[PDB]
Design a binder for this molecule. Structure first.
Ligand code: A1A1R
Ligand code: CL
Ligand code: CL
Ligand code: CL
Ligand code: CL
Ligand code: CL
Ligand code: CL
Ligand code: CL
Ligand code: CL
Ligand code: CL
Ligand code: CL
Ligand code: CL
Ligand code: CL
Ligand code: CL
Ligand code: NA
Length: 265
C-alpha cells in the first residue's frame, strides 16, 4: 500500500546504487513508462537530508531542458525517497561506451561533436540558472533513441555557481582547481569534465583516478584517442582541459563554436 507499489508496476531493474536502485516502471493510470530511483530516506534534519533535498530541487528546476532527463515527481515514504523521471531507452552513455570498447567501434567525429554540443547546451542552461553540475561523466548521461538525444541525468552534485563549499565529483573527471579548493570559476570545471567525457566516448582507455597520468592530463594533455579526429576538433578538446580555467570556453562559447556548427540541429 505504498504509493510506489500502488501507482506503478515494476518492469526491469535499470540502475543500482549503494543505497538503492532504479527500475523501469509503468504507471498504472497513464500507461506510460518511467524510470524511478528509490533510495534510503536520510534522517530528518540531517546534513544528508539537506543534500538529498537539494538534489530533488535540482531535478525540479532543471529537468524541463531538452538535454536534462525530464522530472515528473519525487516523494518520501517511511524509509525511502523516490524520484520519478522519464525513461531513456538508450541507457547510460557509460554502458554505450563499454559496449563500443568491446567491439572496437567508437563514436565517430560527427557523433562526438553531437555529444559535445548536446551536453554543452545542457551546461549552458544549468550555468544560466546560476548553477553548476559538478559531476559530468558518462555514467551520469543518458541516451534517448528515436535522432539520438543525450541528457544529463544524475544531479546529485549540483550546487549554485558561486558556492563557497563544493562536493567534488568523480576524480577521473575532476579539474585540478576544484581539487585545490579554488571555486572562482566553477562552470569551467564542468567544461573540463565534459571534454574528458568526450575523450571517453572517442575510444580512450579508462581514465586514471590519481597518479602520474592523472597529473599529466591536468597539465592540459589529452589522453590517447584510438581514431583519427580533425586537428581543430582535437584542439577544442585540448583547450577545454587547459590548466587555466579562464582559457577554457564557457558553455555559451562552446555551443556557438565554429567546430560544432555542423552538429547543430
Ligand atoms: C537494449 N537496452 C534495454 C535497456 C536500456 N536501458 C535503459 C536504462 C536506463 C536507466 C535510466 C535511468 C534514468 C533514466 N532513464 C534510464 N534508462 C534516470 O532518470 N535515472 C535517475 C533517476 Cl530515475 C532519478 C534521479 C537521478 C537519475 Cl540519474 C537513472 N537511471 C538509471 C538502462 N538500460 C538500454 C537498451
Ligand atoms: Cl503516482
Ligand atoms: Cl542495474
Ligand atoms: Cl523535457
Ligand atoms: Cl518505505
Ligand atoms: Cl529499449
Ligand atoms: Cl543552447
Ligand atoms: Cl563514467
Ligand atoms: Cl561512475
Ligand atoms: Cl588552482
Ligand atoms: Cl566561469
Ligand atoms: Cl573512465
Ligand atoms: Cl594534447
Ligand atoms: Cl581541422
Ligand atoms: Na528534459
Amino acid at each position: 500500500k505504498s504509493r510506489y507499489t500502488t501507482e506503478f508496476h515494476e518492469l526491469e531493474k535499470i540502475g543500482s546504487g549503494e543505497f538503492g536502485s532504479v527500475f523501469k516502471c509503468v504507471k498504472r493510470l497513464d500507461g506510460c513508462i518511467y524510470a524511478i530511483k528509490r533510495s534510503k530516506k536520510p534522517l530528518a534534519g540531517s546534513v544528508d537530508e539537506q543534500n538529498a533535498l537539494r538534489e530533488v530541487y535540482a531535478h525540479a528546476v532543471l529537468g524541463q531542458h531538452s538535454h536534462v532527463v525530464r522530472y515528473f515527481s519525487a516523494w518520501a515514504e517511511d524509509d525511502h525517497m523516490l524520484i520519478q523521471n522519464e525513461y531513456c531507452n538508450g541507457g547510460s552513455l557509460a554502458d554505450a561506451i563499454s559496449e563500443n570498447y568491446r567491439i572496437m567501434s567508437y563514436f565517430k567525429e560527427a557523433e562526438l561533436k553531437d555529444l559535445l554540443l548536446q551536453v554543452g547546451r545542457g551546461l549552458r542552461y544549468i550555468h544560466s540558472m546560476s548553477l553548476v553540475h559538478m559531476d559530468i561523466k558518462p555514467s551520469n548521461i543518458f541516451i534517448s533513441r528515436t535522432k539520438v538525444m543525450f541528457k544529463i541525468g544524475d544531479l546529485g552534485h549540483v550546487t549554485r555557481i558561486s558556492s563557497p563549499q563544493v562536493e567534488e565529483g568523480d576524480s577521473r573527471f575532476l579539474a585540478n582547481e576544484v581539487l585545490q579548493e579554488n571555486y572562482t570559476h566553477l562552470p569551467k570545471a564542468d567544461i573540463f569534465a565534459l571534454a574528458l567525457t568526450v575523450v571517453c566516448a572517442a575510444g580512450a582507455e579508462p581514465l586514471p583516478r590519481n597518479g602520474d597520468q592523472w597529473h599529466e592530463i591536468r597539465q592540459g594533455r589529452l589522453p590517447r584517442i584510438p581514431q583519427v579526429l580533425s586537428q581543430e576538433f582535437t584542439e577544442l578538446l585540448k583547450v577545454m582541459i587547459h590548466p587555466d580555467p579562464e582559457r577554457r570556453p564557457s558553455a555559451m562559447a562552446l555551443v556557438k563554436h565554429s567546430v560544432l556548427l555542423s552538429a547543430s540541429r
